Paper text:
On the other hand, glycogen degradation requires the glycogen debranching enzyme (GDE; GlgX), which directly catalyzes the hydrolysis of α-(1→6)-linked glucose residues and the glycogen phosphorylase (GP; GlgP) to generate glucose-1-phosphate, which feeds into primary metabolism. GlgX is a 79 kDa protein that contains a putative carbohydrate-binding module (CBM_48; PF02922) and alpha amylase, catalytic domain (PF00128).
We first obtained a crystal structure of the apo GlgX enzyme to 3.5 Å resolution (Methods section). Note, a similar dimer was observed in the crystal packing of the apo GlgX. This overlay revealed that significant conformational changes occur upon c-di-GMP binding in several regions of the structure that are transmitted to the active site region. Specifically, c-di-GMP binding leads to a restructuring of two loops formed by residues 432–442 and 579–593 within the C-domain region bound by the second messenger. Importantly, residues 377–396 and 341–355 contain the key catalytic residues, Glu378 and Asp342. Hence, the conformational changes lead to a restructuring of the active site pocket.
Numbering used by the authors:
A (entry chain E): 1 to 549, 553 to 661, 664 to 705
B (entry chain A): 1 to 660, 663 to 705
The structure:
């Protein structure tokens, strides 16, 4: 009942101690109403009249947080002109700092009558839809020391916010599956014992349960399909949904930085949950359709290049703004350490149909907030020629798809070249050069959420995604996976211990390779998705995490004692990866590395093209480490000796240099042998090595 | 020494409490040395070897602010390829946040042998160049009440740092013409008394006195030839040049802001002081010539659209970073509240012939520091289509040149269309909207450092820039002015009062015209340059401000006239409408209730054909003080007394009639020689005639 004009910046819900400033963009709306929602379901419509930059805005004192607010836009309803505004639907603030409730699917949330897509729907959208919230922006990050952990000291961990803690019998069933159950000391401590420096969560941006999904008993579980990029997802909030979740995720980040674990929340900006036409009408299509979504040359239909349904307009400057304003809000206000752009390949494509691609990596590389955080993405190829960009921000990294496809295609049985294999342990120096013209790292992974899990990775040759309901045609088809003898679990102990060390190999490869190793959550305990490699709608025992009570425990203390080895020996984590100098080393008795035959000699000019690159002996030196440290200190370390047997028949290797070596790891024995103490070796002496197995020696 | 790795961000020299972290962008250098200079000219070479994204960087612990550094770059000298590197010229860090010294012009700083322009010079440019200096960024902004005065309240004052406080008999000799002298209670007194709400600083980024001037008896007094966009110009500091100039500036904005006065600084971006080839190799030519300047068609030579030499390759990835990092270092480290873009017209012609132009007005649009501050610049006509940008930063303003050329043409006696002058008072609705598709303001000005001064505008018909040594072919050719009887200083009293009464017309028109006003340093006293209208090279008595003594009768009257026109504006809203006349018409609905209404000398409402008056000499604008349909800071109806503007640009007496039964109290008359805004006023009847001397104004007031 008291309306001041207020300010045009910042857009959204911003509370000035005893007032609130509301701002909403639209360049094609007629009139905007801000409907202050009451608990009894009544609308207190305040027309917003001050116009600046096509943003209507007004300030209401005495309107304190928890206040539920929406928008109503009267605009032209012409699907011929891309004008799909509607006054009946109560729109959502794209800068909603928090959102209450869930989508209750009905006729009302659709904005066209089910019979006619070009007709106008005039149902009230108000009770069924969600509801944006005025977030109290105060928070006490007490000693919030920003963990500036380096890339060459990082161990990422891909974990889901609900699927992680739903079954830990240590957390109250109150906090099970929730953001606070993330910052529980026992869980914050399970990573500390692993030795991970980077927690990369899945989308915490608030997402919508697909209509055609919940009406199938399922629910979007991963949720790369969002509506509001300024709010924690509310079904992960055990502290309620009336703005309290923002104090949740914030209380969970500070506790992570307490134990010095970074947060890397996942980010989708390649489509919106409103989907193509015939979808719902919730936030964007209603406020201003033709300058949030890229429309075809028939304004009635949205160009989905993938299956998503719609794509944002990456040339309309107000859309560029929601992205940089979205990224900045988390880094600064929720104190997040890096991002990862889902379908950054579909993302980086979209720009290049508006010339605006290489002008965006300029925006990234100039801004001080977003540049100096980790940006993790995936390689692409656009138009004709490739990336077609000049300057990659010098933290911008890719998930190495040609390393896992190279590792998976090693213990499987098929060949990768010894050249393909040399450059992969090396840290993919051939695809990611540190120049400042290419991504500067490789996020090595043997597995992630897409495709199998490490357990399923050696247990199936075809998927078993009939549980997704998509006719089994979905999901990665050629997982490059070998099942070790039979499909499904079988009792046969002969093969059941075969797999148990196949994962002891998949994990060891990841840790000794140069670069950034990433673990998917559950591959320490041996997590199984029932052969399902795309579990996006399995919000159940499929992608829950079973917590152990020996087999599942041997691998946990395998991983946890392996990660010790990575953190402890600097030849496996070289600040400048082998970007400069060759993979063989300039052959002499000083090089950082030199490759050997199981027979004993060095590889040679026409030896590097070994199609059956099954066996290898890689010697890394502990004194050729040509990098200064934190303070100009020469980082030094022992020399190590790797011996790979990606070949069934037992192989006999020979340790060169005549020097007392110590076997520090052996895949083949069942008790797990990072921790189990080992014997000394002489060097030169013939050793036998089990099939499909690794061994590593140590000497200063 | 002792060499640690360091980082690559932030570019430039940054003091760490115990160290200094250097970084320099050069994507074509082959190896970069850092040179720590002592006082006894000793260069300690430290080979920066770490290379992330073509930034060579190292961390030097124990290096302290005040320690002099520079860069030396080993790259190929092939101008047929465009590379003009030379290991022998002690470069400067483009990010250096305080610079010491001065160009000591000789053969050594130019980077080529004075016989051939295409060959290679090997002269040590270390004792003849400036030297970058590490700076301590700590400062105590106790309560920096950033005076975020809105555009309708803004009274902008264009001063020059030296040219404001050089001849003041209140400042000690120490602080005359400096930054700390800018912080004096005296000048801040005269800035408040006048009522300025934002002081505009002529170029403050360190600039290079052109060799063409230093071997000419002259020097670059303005400073539109800059080198390091991050440093206070050293020659303005009375405390020291090894870094300390940052500590003046901050304590200076500090003292200004406490008074409620913004700081809008002028920035020189269209060109760099190394200029075109045959120019001194100072900062960027040697580091990386390709990715700073706009070379084209032939590598050796620089696309010259700027007309002042080198342009700056607006698509280069680290040229966008240098500009944006330089804009906001002044807003969030020096606490500046706004900017002014010299030669924004040309800069937009450099930004668009790379097709990065639109990409920039989006880059300013999102950025929270550069967007939300006052952005002042020039109109332009780019390539094909004029503006050719979509949506402006909705704080973007222009220097309303079609205002001054329209009011100069008026009190000189030329027939600017009765519509061309309607919209100019009105808030310049026609050229400046508020959607976001055009600049959301109409910054007005009668005169400035470009062109005449206000006592010169009324005394000379042609420029007199002979003292510039450019043969008087430089300067605005027709300044649309008139000398008022005898060109120069006359003894004729009939002339001498005509001027100081024309000057009252020019100042008063300005202070009632909608939009955002602006004055230049000297007009409150009426400073004369001697008809010199481009005094860029007069660092002498020509453009210092003379301060009026106490027994200086006439000059003190203009000052007391000016100090109360700002009063009349800061005290009555009707002369500054939050949304200027931007939706409404320049006439209003011709009925009982309109914010505005235009009448005749003879006393009738002007007709639509009467809106086509070539000889548009006489006028009477009514503003309704109750028809202000704009909300308050809290939603109040802002209501006022009604005003009555009467103009006569004629040359004989014209009798006006007061259009409005009720009564009017005359509050401003220009023909009065005592000065009316600081005087009393008779009562006009409400229909009675008034005799109005030629070239004179009258404002009446009534609640």
């Amino acid at each position: 009942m008291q309306v001041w004009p207020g300010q045009a910046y910042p857009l959204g819900a911003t509370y000035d101690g005893a007032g609130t400033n509301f701002a909403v963009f639209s360049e094609a709306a007629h009139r905007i109403e801000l409907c202050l929602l009451h608990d009894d379901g009544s609308e207190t419509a305040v027309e917003l009249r001050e116009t600046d930059a096509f943003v209507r805005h007004a300030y209401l004192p005495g309107v304190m947080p928890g206040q539920r607010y929406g928008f109503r836009v009267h605009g032209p309803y012409a699907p011929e002109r891309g004008l799909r505004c509607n006054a009946a639907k109560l729109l959502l603030d794209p800068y909603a700092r928090a959102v209450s409730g869930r989508v209750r699917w009905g006729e009302a949330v659709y904005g066209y009558p089910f019979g006619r897509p070009d007709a106008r729907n005039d149902l009230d959208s108000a009770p069924d839809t969600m509801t944006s919230v005025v977030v109290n922006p105060y928070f006490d990050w007490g000693d919030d020391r920003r963990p500036r952990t380096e890339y060459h000291h990082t161990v990422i961990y891909e974990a889901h916010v609900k699927g992680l803690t739903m079954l830990h019998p240590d957390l109250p069933e109150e906090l099970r599956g929730t953001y606070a159950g993330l910052a529980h000391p026992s869980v914050i401590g399970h990573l500390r014992e692993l030795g991970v420096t980077a927690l990369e969560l899945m989308p915490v941006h608030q997402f919508v349960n697909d209509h055609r999904l919940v009406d199938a008993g399922l629910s979007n579980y991963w949720g790369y399909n969002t509506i509001g990029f300024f709010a924690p997802h509310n079904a992960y909030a055990s502290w309620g949904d009336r703005g309290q979740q923002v104090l949740e995720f914030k209380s969970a980040v500070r506790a992570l930085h307490q134990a010095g674990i970074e947060v890397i929340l996942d980010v989708v900006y390649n489509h919106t949950a409103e989907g193509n036409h015939l979808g719902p009408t919730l936030s964007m299509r209603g406020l201003d359709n033709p300058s949030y979504y890229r429309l075809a040359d028939d304004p009635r239909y949205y160009m989905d290049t993938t299956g998503t349904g719609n794509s944002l307009l990456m040339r309309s400057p107000h859309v560029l703004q929601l992205i940089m304003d979205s990224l900045r809000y988390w880094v600064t206000e929720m104190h997040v350490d890096g991002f990862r752009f889902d379908l950054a390949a579909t993302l980086a494509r979209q720009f290049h149909e508006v010339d605006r691609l290489s002008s965006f990596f300029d925006l990234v590389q100039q801004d001080p907030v977003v540049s100096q955080v980790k940006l993790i993405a995936e390689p692409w190829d656009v138009g004709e020629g490739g990336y077609q960009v000049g300057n990659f921000p010098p933290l911008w990294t890719e998930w190495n798809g040609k390393y896992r496809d190279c590792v998976r295609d090693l213990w499987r049985g098929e060949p990768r070249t010894l050249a393909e294999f040399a450059s992969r342990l090396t840290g993919s120096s051939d695809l990611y050069q540190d120049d400042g013209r290419r991504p500067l790292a490789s996020v090595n992974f043997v597995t992630c959420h897409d495709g199998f899990t490490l357990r399923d990775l050696v247990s199936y040759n075809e998927k078993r995604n009939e549980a997704n309901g998509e006719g089994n045609r979905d999901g990665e088809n050629y997982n490059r996976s070998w099942n070790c003898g039979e499909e499904g679990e079988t009792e046969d102990v002969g093969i059941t211990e075969l797999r148990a060390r196949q994962m002891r190999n998949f994990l060891a490869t990841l840790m000794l390779s140069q670069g950034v190793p990433m673990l998917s959550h559950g591959d320490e305990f041996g997590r199984t998705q029932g052969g399902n490699n795309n579990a996006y709608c399995q919000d159940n025992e499929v992608s829950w995490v079973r917590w152990p009570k020996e087999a599942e425990a041997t691998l946990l203390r395998f991983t946890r004692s392996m990660v010790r080895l990575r953190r402890e020996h600097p030849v496996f984590r070289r600040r400048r990866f082998f970007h400069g100098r060759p993979v063989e080393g300039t052959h002499d008795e000083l090089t950082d590395i030199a490759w050997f035959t199981p027979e004993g000699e060095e590889m040679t000019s026409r030896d590097w093209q070994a199609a059956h690159a099954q066996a290898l002996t890689v010697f890394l030196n502990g004194n050729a480490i040509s990098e200064p440290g934190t303070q100009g200190e020469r980082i030094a370390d022992d020399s190590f000796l790797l011996m790979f047997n990606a070949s069934a028949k037992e192989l006999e290797f020979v340790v060169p240099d005549s020097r007392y070596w110590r076997m520090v790891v052996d895949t083949s024995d069942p008790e797990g042998m990072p921790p189990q103490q080992g014997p000394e070796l002489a060097g030169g002496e013939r050793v036998t090595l089990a099939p499909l197995s690794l061994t590593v020696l140590r000497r200063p």
